[PDB]
Write an enzyme that holds these catalytic residues in place. Structure first.
Site, PDB file in Angstrom:
ATOM      1  N   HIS A  41       0.904  -1.245  -0.068  1.00 35.10           N
ATOM      2  CA  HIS A  41      -0.161  -0.091  -0.024  1.00 35.10           C
ATOM      3  C   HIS A  41       1.016   1.301   0.119  1.00 35.10           C
ATOM      4  O   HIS A  41       0.273   2.677   0.022  1.00 35.10           O
ATOM      5  CB  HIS A  41      -0.922  -0.114   1.247  1.00 35.10           C
ATOM      6  N   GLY A 143       2.799   5.612  10.416  1.00 38.03           N
ATOM      7  CA  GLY A 143       4.325   5.610   9.935  1.00 38.03           C
ATOM      8  C   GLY A 143       4.917   4.202  10.256  1.00 38.03           C
ATOM      9  O   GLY A 143       6.285   4.043   9.741  1.00 38.03           O
ATOM     10  N   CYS A 145       3.908   1.130   9.395  1.00 45.68           N
ATOM     11  CA  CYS A 145       3.671   0.031   8.460  1.00 45.68           C
ATOM     12  C   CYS A 145       5.157  -0.220   7.982  1.00 45.68           C
ATOM     13  O   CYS A 145       6.062   0.719   7.606  1.00 45.68           O
ATOM     14  CB  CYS A 145       2.857   0.530   7.171  1.00 45.68           C
TER      15      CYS A 145
END
Lengths: 306, 306
Positions: A41, A143, A145
């Protein structure tokens, strides 16, 4: 003596964390040899989070649309491909700090260390278990991920988790390092829920053994139970079923302490039916289920890693 | 969201751990530039542990009586000196992995990460607090002496603890990196006891604020208390006194949540007088006191370190 929620030394993983930037999105990547792994993503825009078609989004990207930063050094992307929910960025430099490593998909009930990162910079390390409902109770902010979870075995880092998202209940969902989610979750911002969780019975038993190894015995009793009869009580308390294979795994701890597994089950039974009566075990007023039998042997006996 | 017992990334310290061997004793040392720091009782023999005179023991040693092993590389000792309870071994090679670092002596109530080591090999990382009685509730086995505790501030490692010994109650005592013990303890194997401990009140308050930051509010109330009146109740429950300076430190968390410090004190008061009534806060059925106000801001807001 003592018993702590112990993570693995994180240095071998720290040397792999990088920052991946595509358009307006920045997250963490894992740099092993000449490949950077990160959640797919990263290619999503704030307007494409609701139901993105990633194949369509990615064919619109070029190599130079991906900024990979390792420290204050920019890595050049020379290929990209999507594998399940992870993106693999081929870069022109192999990471000289690549440890010996494997990718492993773990079973629920297994524990791992998480190196929480932001902008490719490690923030902290803590220990997690994969819950029976395939979430983890992490500690993650915007942030985070692409932060990874791992175990270390002698000199080999087994990566088992990459962080993708937070669920409405504040628990967390992510993938193995090949990009397959743990549980039924998908990487789109639509209504998703964890599903009913349960207590990891074999882990609670291991931690009761840890308590005995460390000199705690107050919770034992002179009763025993059958595996069948224990499981009838466990179900009532939202514990997952104890299998004979769980019993076998607890063998080494049983032998070290002289307490038959089924006798420790009778002690657990009593703790479930009576509570702890204002008492604590290993500094906890709850029955702890995020230590595996392996974790207890590792900490109460002292295995290192080179 | 989430709240975990979070340690600092340990890689900068891992690169400093070595094995120190003198005679029959092997323990861990900390290798910074060309000096190896380790507990002075490495020069002790099993018959000299009862009441050793270290000056007399050390003048009998030569440089070559000390084996320092860093990985599979032997470091040559070219000088030695004793500073308080630590030995400083000058070696002929500076550690190329020396981070930016300081030595800091911390105040009780402060937290730190511990890198548990055996034979110079890191085993695990966990978070600790210095208790008000200057012990720590660590997790340490034979061979762990010389393992260090630390905080990391941007890029700088502040070493604050070196492990020396386990007390009869299973808690742990050690020194700052200049060799001064925390608390009244001495490095001899004679009758020593921790002394009555207390709960770190300012830390419990910080953790109540952490709970509110993360969406927990069940434990608040509409009461307030004076600092004086709070402290009268704290004393009754073995909490250490809350000072105005503690109040000042809690200012930033107060402002972020909109809850006056003294109002959170009234909530704590009620939790002390009534218990938690089968409820939990941040996954704990006990009031947790090993997070500082700084720890909460770091984790609930997300500070990294390079």
């Amino acid at each position: 003596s003592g018993f702590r929620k112990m993570a693995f030394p994180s240095g071998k993983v720290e040397g792999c964390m990088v920052q991946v930037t595509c358009g307006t999105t920045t997250l963490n990547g894992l740099w092993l040899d000449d490949v950077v792994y990160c959640p797919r993503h990263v290619i999503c825009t704030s307007e494409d989070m609701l139901n993105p078609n990633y194949e369509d989004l990615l064919i619109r990207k070029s190599n130079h649309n991906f900024l990979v930063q390792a420290g204050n050094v920019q890595l050049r992307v020379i290929g990209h491909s999507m594998q399940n929910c992870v993106l693999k960025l081929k870069v022109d430099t192999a990471n000289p700090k690549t440890p010996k490593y494997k990718f492993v998909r773990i079973q629920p009930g297994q524990t791992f260390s998480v190196l929480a990162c932001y902008n490719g910079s490690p923030s902290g390390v803590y220990q997690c278990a994969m819950r029976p409902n395939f979430t983890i109770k992490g500690s993650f902010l915007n942030g985070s991920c692409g932060s990874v979870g791992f175990n270390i075995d002698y000199d080999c880092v087994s990566f088992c988790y990459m962080h993708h998202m937070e669920l409405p209940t504040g628990v967390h969902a992510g993938t193995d390092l090949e990009g397959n989610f743990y549980g039924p979750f998908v990487d789109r911002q639509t209504a998703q829920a964890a599903g009913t969780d349960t207590t990891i019975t074999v882990n609670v038993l291991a931690w009761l053994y840890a308590a005995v190894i460390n000199g705690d015995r107050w919770f034992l009793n002179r009763f025993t139970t059958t595996l069948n009869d224990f499981n009838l009580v466990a179900m009532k308390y939202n514990y997952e079923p104890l299998t004979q294979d769980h019993v076998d795994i607890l063998g080494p701890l049983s032998a070290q302490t002289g307490i038959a597994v089924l006798d420790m089950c009778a002690s657990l039974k009593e703790l479930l039916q009576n509570g702890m009566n204002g008492r604590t075990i290993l500094g906890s007023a709850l029955l702890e289920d995020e230590f595996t039998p392996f974790d207890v042997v590792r900490q109460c006996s002292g295995v290192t890693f080179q």
